[PDB]
Amino acid sequence: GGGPGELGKPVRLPKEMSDEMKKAVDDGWTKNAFNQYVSDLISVHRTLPDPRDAWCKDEARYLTNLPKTDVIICFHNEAWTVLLRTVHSVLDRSPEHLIGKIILVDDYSDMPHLKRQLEDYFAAYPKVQIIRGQKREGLIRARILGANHAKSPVLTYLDSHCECTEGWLEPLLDRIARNSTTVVCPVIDVISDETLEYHYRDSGGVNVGGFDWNLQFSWHPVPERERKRHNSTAEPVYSPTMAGGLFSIDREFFDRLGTYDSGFDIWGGENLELSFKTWMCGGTLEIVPCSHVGHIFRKRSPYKWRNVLKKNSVRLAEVWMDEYSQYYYHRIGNDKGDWGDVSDRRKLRNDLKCKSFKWYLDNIYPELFIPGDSVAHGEIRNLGYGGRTCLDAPAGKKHQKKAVGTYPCHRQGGNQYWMLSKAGEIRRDDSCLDYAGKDVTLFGCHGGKGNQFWTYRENTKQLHHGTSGKCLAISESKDKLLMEECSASLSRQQWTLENYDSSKL
Ligand SMILES: O=c1ccn([C@@H]2O[C@H](COP(=O)(O)OP(=O)(O)O)[C@@H](O)[C@H]2O)c(=O)[nH]1
Ligand SMILES: *[C@@H]1O[C@H](CO)[C@@H](O)[C@H](O)[C@H]1NC(C)=O
Ligand SMILES: [Mn+2]
């Protein structure tokens, strides 16, 4: 008898339900930003399907002597059944002799079930130790507390809403056992927040980590330069950056790299910091397609707030990004703010004798588009009806299927930051302007030109669409961004593009 959710199948609550049941379902969504009521019906030892490729069972060989790892799971107000299932998943699917301590770091959670109730439950489980923080300090400082209580040669981090799968630990530990400067992440699969269903995929469609120039992590598929390094797609692949929070690193190597920046605030790109340090200071970062961990992805985080990631992102750039720091500052309007004292980190970098950031981009992440190489980058200004209207929209996968609009120019960047590429893209990060006969849209650059292809006609100042033959323009209300027949005499069809350089063409 496996129960609800056995083998990763979804769980759906009745269509019509009593009121007390409704209150509890909503109670669960309010507290956790997933459906706790569903999670509570699912076994804490919920069985899962084997997501590993044929290659991972048959043709992959791992060294016989692997380093003992500690597992650090930070949490704050995590749900009972969810936290337990993460811990029970490590114990049940990891070879006993490879787990030293399962360290649960508390970070000043206040819900009763994580206090004494957790202590009594894991009393029977000797490898589980509970460290309690004295005040809410956030993820970054908590992982550092866990690394201080850990004595095993290797650290492995997991969120409190994860599920390890069959064979998850050996392929990660194998990479470190070959070479200790190697940081590794499992493939991070999706557990539905609504049904807790488990979703895994072919090692063909594996994504490797990069970043947008707002210093946010972002996924991209494995570059061909990398795929050509491998006889099979299930071998470990280089990844210029980690998503963060699920990874394994050598404990002393973690220490040597300065762990996380002590001066970061909660809103941190510590994941980006650790990634750059690993590459630039004698290590490598790998995604191991043979290792799958499920994670409960949430649409929002229900945490107290204490723009705002700006401090952590500027320290990351002031220390680690050399001349390329300027490209982050453009996106935030050069309002760098006050990132605090950062001297300790500059000394740390010099003592380790790390490579330059250009080296990182040139050798590890050369696929990344550098805004300085574009024909123009900055705001896109329309000269019509006052000349104080700018191309303005948000990017991302939620703001796909939105029409791109217009808004008054604030020289602050962000939503009015764009690059005109040599390949005729008007873009922000991996998003491209696109026109297929209804509205102008921002979605994902496919690199095929066509409807994502534009021409800036220097003498006329028009933005010309190759396939529709139309010209880009703004309406009289200045609220909408439309396509119309090209007329040289129309001011609503004129644009000036910041940093236009003819020679980048
Ligand atoms: O102040 C906090 C809030 C979050 N968490 C924990 O940090 C882990 C990762 O956080 P989260 O899942 O919210 O980040 P995400 O994966 O959504 O980016 C989770 O186990 C949380 O319980 C924490 O340690 N301190
Ligand atoms: C070990 O770690 C990485 C993997 O290639 C690399 O930086 C380093 O040169 C490797 N070699 C040695 C001798 O440690
Ligand atoms: Mn998470």
Numbering used by the authors: 143 to 448, 452 to 650
Any passages from the paper?
CG30463 is predicted to encode a ppGalNAcT/PGANT, which is an O-glycosyltransferase responsible for the post-translational addition of the sugar N-acetylgalactosamine (GalNAc) to proteins, a modification typically found on mucins and other secreted and membrane-bound proteins. ppGalNAcTs are type II membrane proteins that belong to the CAZy family GT2731. Interestingly, we found two distinct Drosophila cDNA clones emanating from the CG30463 gene, differing only in a ~30 amino acid region (the α subunit) of the lectin domain. Comparison of these clones to genomic sequence data revealed that they represent splice variants of exon 8. This splicing event generates an α subunit with a net positive charge (isoform A, containing exon 8A) or a net negative charge (isoform B, containing exon 8B). PGANT9A and PGANT9B adopt the canonical ppGalNAcT tertiary structure where a ~10 amino acid flexible linker connects the N-terminal catalytic domain to the C-terminal lectin domain.
PGANT9A crystallizes with 4 molecules in the asymmetric unit, and each molecule contains electron density in the active site consistent with a catalytic Mn2+ ion coordinated by the conserved active site residues Asp 301, His 303, and His 437, and 2 oxygens from the α and β phosphate of UDP. However, there is insufficient electron density to model in a peptide, and the partially ordered active site loop containing residues Arg 440 to Arg 448 is in a semi-closed conformation. In PGANT9A, Lys 542, Lys 543, Lys 546, and Lys 547 in the α subunit loop form a basic patch that extends towards the active site with the shortest distance of ~14 Å from Lys 542 to the nearest UDP phosphate. The distribution of positively charged residues in the α subunit of PGANT9A creates a predominantly positively charged patch that extends the entire length of the lectin domain, and the proximity of the positively charged loop to the active site suggests that it dictates preferences for substrates that contain negatively charged residues, as the positively charged surface could form non-specific electrostatic interactions with the substrate to position it for catalysis. Likewise, positively charged substrates might be excluded from accessing the active site given the position of the positively charged loop. Thus, both enzymes have two distinct charged patches in their lectin domain formed by the α-subunit that results in preferences to recruit either negatively (PGANT9A) or positively (PGANT9B) charged substrates to the active site for catalysis. In PGANT9A and PGANT9B, the loop is closer to the active site than in the other ppGalNAcTs. To further interrogate this model, we redesigned the PTTTK peptide to replace all positively charged amino acids with negatively charged ones (PTTTE peptide; PTTTEPTTTEPTTTE).
